[PDB]
Amino acid sequence: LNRAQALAKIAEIKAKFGLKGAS
Amino acid sequence: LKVPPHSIEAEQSVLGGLMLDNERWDDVAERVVADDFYTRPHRHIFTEMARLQESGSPIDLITLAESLERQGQLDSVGGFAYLAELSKNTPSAANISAYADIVRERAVVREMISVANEIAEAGFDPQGRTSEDLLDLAESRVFKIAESRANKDEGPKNIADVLDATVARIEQLFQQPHDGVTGVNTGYDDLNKKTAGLQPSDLIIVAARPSMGKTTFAMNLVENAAMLQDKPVLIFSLEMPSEQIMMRSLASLSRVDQTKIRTGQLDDEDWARISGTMGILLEKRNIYIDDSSGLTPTEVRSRARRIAREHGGIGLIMIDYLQLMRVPALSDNRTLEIAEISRSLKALAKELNVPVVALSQLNRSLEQRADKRPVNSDLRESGSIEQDADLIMFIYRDEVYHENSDLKGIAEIIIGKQRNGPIGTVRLTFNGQWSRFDNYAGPQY
Amino acid sequence: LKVPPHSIEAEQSVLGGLMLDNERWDDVAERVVADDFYTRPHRHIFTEMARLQESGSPIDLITLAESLERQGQLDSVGGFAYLAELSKNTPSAANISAYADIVRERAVVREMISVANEIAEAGFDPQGRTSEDLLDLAESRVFKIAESRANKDEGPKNIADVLDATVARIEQLFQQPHDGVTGVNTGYDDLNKKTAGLQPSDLIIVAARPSMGKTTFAMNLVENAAMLQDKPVLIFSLEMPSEQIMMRSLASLSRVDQTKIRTGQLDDEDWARISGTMGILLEKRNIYIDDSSGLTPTEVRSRARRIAREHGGIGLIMIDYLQLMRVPALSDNRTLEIAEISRSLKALAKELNVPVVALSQLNRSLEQRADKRPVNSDLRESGSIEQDADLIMFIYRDEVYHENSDLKGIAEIIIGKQRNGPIGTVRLTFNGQWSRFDNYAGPQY
Ligand SMILES: Nc1ncnc2c1ncn2[C@@H]1O[C@H](COP(=O)(O)OP(=O)(O)O)[C@@H](O)[C@H]1O
Ligand SMILES: Nc1ncnc2c1ncn2[C@@H]1O[C@H](COP(=O)(O)OP(=O)(O)O)[C@@H](O)[C@H]1O
Numbered sequence: 001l002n003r004a005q006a007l008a009k010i011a012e013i014k015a016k017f018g019l020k021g022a023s
Numbered sequence: 024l025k026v027p028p029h030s031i032e033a034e035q036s037v038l039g040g041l042m043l044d045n046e047r048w049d050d051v052a053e054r055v056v057a058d059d060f061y062t063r064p065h066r067h068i069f070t071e072m073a074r075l076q077e078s079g080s081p082i083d084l085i086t087l088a089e090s091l092e093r094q095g096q097l098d099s100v101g102g103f104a105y106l107a108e109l110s111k112n113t114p115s116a117a118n119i120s121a122y123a124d125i126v127r128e129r130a131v132v133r134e135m136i137s138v139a140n141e142i143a144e145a146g147f148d149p150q151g152r153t154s155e156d157l158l159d160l161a162e163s164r165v166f167k168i169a170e171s172r173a174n175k176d177e178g179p180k181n182i183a184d185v186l187d188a189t190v191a192r193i194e195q196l197f198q199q200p201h202d203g204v205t206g207v208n209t210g211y212d213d214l215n216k217k218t219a220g221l222q223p224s225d226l227i228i229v230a231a232r233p234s235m236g237k238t239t240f241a242m243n244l245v246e247n248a249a250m251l252q253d254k255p256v257l258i259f260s261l262e263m264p265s266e267q268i269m270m271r272s273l274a275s276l277s278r279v280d281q282t283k284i285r286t287g288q289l290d291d292e293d294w295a296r297i298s299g300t301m302g303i304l305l306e307k308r309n310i311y312i313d314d315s316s317g318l319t320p321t322e323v324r325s326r327a328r329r330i331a332r333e334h335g336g337i338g339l340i341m342i343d344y345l346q347l348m349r350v351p352a353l354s355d356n357r358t359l360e361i362a363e364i365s366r367s368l369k370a371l372a373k374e375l376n377v378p379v380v381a382l383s384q385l386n387r388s389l390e391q392r393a394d395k396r397p398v399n400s401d402l403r404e405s406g407s408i409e410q411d412a413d414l415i416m417f418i419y420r421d422e423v424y425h426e427n428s429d430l431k432g433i434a435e436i437i438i439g440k441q442r443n444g445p446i447g448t449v450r451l452t453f454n455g456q457w458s459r460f461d462n463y464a465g466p467q468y
Numbered sequence: 469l470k471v472p473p474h475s476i477e478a479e480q481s482v483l484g485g486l487m488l489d490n491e492r493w494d495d496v497a498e499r500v501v502a503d504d505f506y507t508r509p510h511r512h513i514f515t516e517m518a519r520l521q522e523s524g525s526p527i528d529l530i531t532l533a534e535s536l537e538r539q540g541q542l543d544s545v546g547g548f549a550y551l552a553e554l555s556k557n558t559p560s561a562a563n564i565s566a567y568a569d570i571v572r573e574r575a576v577v578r579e580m581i582s583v584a585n586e587i588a589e590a591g592f593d594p595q596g597r598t599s600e601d602l603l604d605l606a607e608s609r610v611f612k613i614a615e616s617r618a619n620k621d622e623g624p625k626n627i628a629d630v631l632d633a634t635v636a637r638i639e640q641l642f643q644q645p646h647d648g649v650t651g652v653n654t655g656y657d658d659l660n661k662k663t664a665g666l667q668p669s670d671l672i673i674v675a676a677r678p679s680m681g682k683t684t685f686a687m688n689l690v691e692n693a694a695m696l697q698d699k700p701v702l703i704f705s706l707e708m709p710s711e712q713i714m715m716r717s718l719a720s721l722s723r724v725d726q727t728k729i730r731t732g733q734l735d736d737e738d739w740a741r742i743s744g745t746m747g748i749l750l751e752k753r754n755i756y757i758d759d760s761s762g763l764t765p766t767e768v769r770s771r772a773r774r775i776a777r778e779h780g781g782i783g784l785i786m787i788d789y790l791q792l793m794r795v796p797a798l799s800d801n802r803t804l805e806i807a808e809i810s811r812s813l814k815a816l817a818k819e820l821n822v823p824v825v826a827l828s829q830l831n832r833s834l835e836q837r838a839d840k841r842p843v844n845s846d847l848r849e850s851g852s853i854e855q856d857a858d859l860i861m862f863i864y865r866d867e868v869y870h871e872n873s874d875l876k877g878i879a880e881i882i883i884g885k886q887r888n889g890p891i892g893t894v895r896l897t898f899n900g901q902w903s904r905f906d907n908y909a910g911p912q913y
């Protein structure tokens with residue numbers, strides 16, 4: 001994965017697992 | 024009024040019963056101490072009676088009054104009139120055990136009231152103390168109040184009771200359908216067979232030369248214990264920050280190369296594995312990590328107690344490593360510091376009924392021997408560590424010293440000391456790519 | 469009348485500062501809750517302000533008064549008179565965070581006093597509870613105080629937060645990999661790759677046997693940091709006078725032989741080079757040298773703070789060396805003195821958010837080992853240095869011990885401990901003529 005793909009995957013992981021306090 | 028909780032009748036009854044029946048001293052001596060009496064005359068009488076009883080003399084009325092008179096302390100007690108009144112007024116047919124328990128109980132409650140008053144007074148006049156200092160003071164006071172009562176249950180037990188407990192333990196060993204594990208599951212089959220897991224109330228030492236995979240193996244044990252159990256697992260790490268611990272844990276659980284994680288060069292399958300691992304970890308949620316530096320045994324014990332209070336018990340405690348812990352009052356001598364650390368860890372393990380796994384280092388001279396596998400004598404500066412540990416496991420990788428080694432990827436766990444079993448070497452597979460130890464699948468001689 | 473602890477002025481300051489400046493609200497919100505305020509009106513005011521801030525409305529005087537008047541609660545607070553008093557007395561020079569911390573502190577003290585009163589009143593009235601029940605009740609009440617509190621930056625955190633921090637760090641590293649030119653530049657490509665520069669808030673130790681080139685390497689690092697940045701670079705040279713350091717720096721920057729400068733045998737081109745170097749240095753003006761001897765950690769911290777205040781920050785701090793520093797209160801024990809020095813240096817590094825490099829010496833026994841490359845244990849009497857340092861580098865030159873060495877002119881920087889990265893050996897070229905280290909252009913294994 002490149003930069004954008006890795007960022008999208010990480011964002012999807014965060015959305016699936018919640019943890020809204022990271023931002 | 025704010026009455027001080029006490030009961031004179033129980034004390035007078037106890038003293039009268041002791042005067043009348045000298046054979047009951049023991050039944051009173053195991054339930055109450057001299058300092059447990061509320062009035063000065065009663066404490067003085069009890070002290071004199073203890074002196075007479077342990078000097079081999081009768082404790083009748085005339086001898087006790089005369090002996091108090093000889094030391095000039097008879098008038099302070101109340102006189103021969105008061106001693107005779109104590110002897111006469113209290114009936115012989117009494118249950119002195121209940122009275123001794125009552126005297127024991129009032130002392131504890133009164134001391135609790137005293138500590139509460141001291142806490143309030145300290146709160147009103149902090150004298151430069153922070154909230155943390157006040158909390159430390161309160162915890163120390165309540166701990167001094169509560170701890171050490173347990174010596175009543177500790178002592179010479181009856182042979183029948185110990186035999187019955189042993190029979191219960193053996194029959195529970197027989198009846199259990201597990202595969203040889205009675206304690207916390209280590210996650211490795213051969214080590215489980217040889218050790219029956221990590222036993223509660225035992226001191227466990229993990230030792231290796233630097234860069235042998237000591238922290239990696241310990242983290243693998245932690246992950247296996249977390250996966251195969253339900254009780255919380257607590258980690259104290261003076262060596263690495265919690266973020267690196269979590270990165271290693273992700274590499275171990277997801278089976279993804281650690282270099283890729285460090286450099287960010289991951290692929291789709293690795294991302295899927297990491298997602299699955301994160302989902303499992305967030306589903307379980309039973310691992311706690313404390314990466315503070317410069318820990319002292321008091322801090323470790325306090326935080327472990329806080330965790331056990333919060334979650335009703337611990338399943339395993341892991342410390343990495345004990346060579347970084349500090350005891351400020353014994354900083355002058357390192358050997359005494361290590362001995363105090365080991366004793367406090369063993370006491371904590373016994374108290375909380377949990378396995379405690381502490382990591383430790385060995386001496387450098389070991390690398391100058393013909394054979395570099397550790398022995399007990401290789402724990403120099405740490406004799407108390409060898410003396411107090413219930414289990415001692417050394418990690419040995421042959422490829423670390425020899426590039427020609429035929430044992431690449433193979434690690435040896437060497438049992439230097441086993442309190443309740445055999446000793447020897449167990450082989451495992453080392454995958455440094457994922458920072459993991461696994462069961463050895465090769466042939467076993 | 470025993471007044472329980474409170475301070476109306478601090479509460480009034482918090483409310484007034486929130487009234488005058490609404491952008492500070494978050495700082496107050498993270499430090500205080502509505503239950504920490506002693507008077508009912510102050511709690512009501514803070515609750516109304518919290519609700520208004522949540523709804524998105526401003527919380528200035530007029531808006532707050534209008535909102536209170538709508539709900540009919542203006543009379544309970546004290547009126548627009550009291551609101552105007554709060555507005556008037558509080559100045560706009562408000563450090564609301566400190567006042568909020570003070571409010572928090574009073575609340576903790578109040579709760580501790582109340583819990584002590586409850587425990588004592590329970591002691592006077594057992595109501596059938598046993599001693600174990602009373603002790604458990606007291607322990608639970610006292611322990612509940614520390615629940616949560618500020619155990620985020622002062623204790624174990626939540627696993628999800630640590631995992632998110634790891635993910636964010638991986639994102640930051642992978643998005644823009646510049647190969648060690650993101651933190652403080654070290655001036656060496658391989659050292660930048662292995663260490664990612666000299667990280668702020670990190671303690672860095674440089675160690676070697678005498679005459680290996682510790683001072684030379686440290687000065688080269690200082691020169692590289694000064695040339696590749698704009699912030700001041702501060703040197704604490706307890707080993708050499710500033711004149712010799714400046715002569716070495718001139719030799720390094722102008723690439724003139726150090727012996728020629730020391731003996732004055734310079735030709736016209738060398739004089740031109742030295743003049744150019746001096747001109748560049750006087751144009752930059754970002755190097756500060758302090759050659760005092762016997763410095764305590766307090767003086768070092770004070771002078772570093774003074775420099776950071778005067779010139780708006782620091783980029784690197786260098787100390788040479790820590791075996792010459794003094795702690796008079798611990799002069800009897802060398803280990804305690806070194807531990808105190810390392811602790812204070814780490815605290816200073818964390819406070820000023822700067823890399824702190826401290827030089828150290830090794831024991832003679834290293835020259836007796838089969839392999840003379842330095843190791844951590846060669847830091848005898850300085851275990852705390854190994855414990856507290858974020859980065860540890862050893863300087864080794866093979867040509868010092870072997871005249872017929874094949875590695876002449878090649879020095880090794882061995883990373884014995886890195887807290888946030890890998891470890892290994894970095895090879896550099898040693899030009900002793902110019903007192904310089906340079907990047908190794910030879911083949912790399
Ligand atoms: N990404 C990796 N690839 C291969 N080996 C690694 C990796 N990370 C760590 N290791 C190995 O782990 C060993 C030591 O790790 P660790 O257990 O954390 O330290 P210690 O053994 O001192 O406790 C080193 O010998 C190293 O070879
Ligand atoms: N003019 C010079 N020519 C060659 N080498 C030099 C010269 N001056 C200093 N050196 C080298 O510098 C090394 C030590 O320098 P320095 O780092 O200042 O002292 P230390 O290593 O004790 O901190 C010596 O080993 C020496 O070989």
Ligand SMILES: [Mg+2]
Pocket residue numbers: 237238239262
């Ligand atoms: Mg380790």
Ligand SMILES: [Mg+2]
Pocket residue numbers: 682683684707
């Ligand atoms: Mg020098």
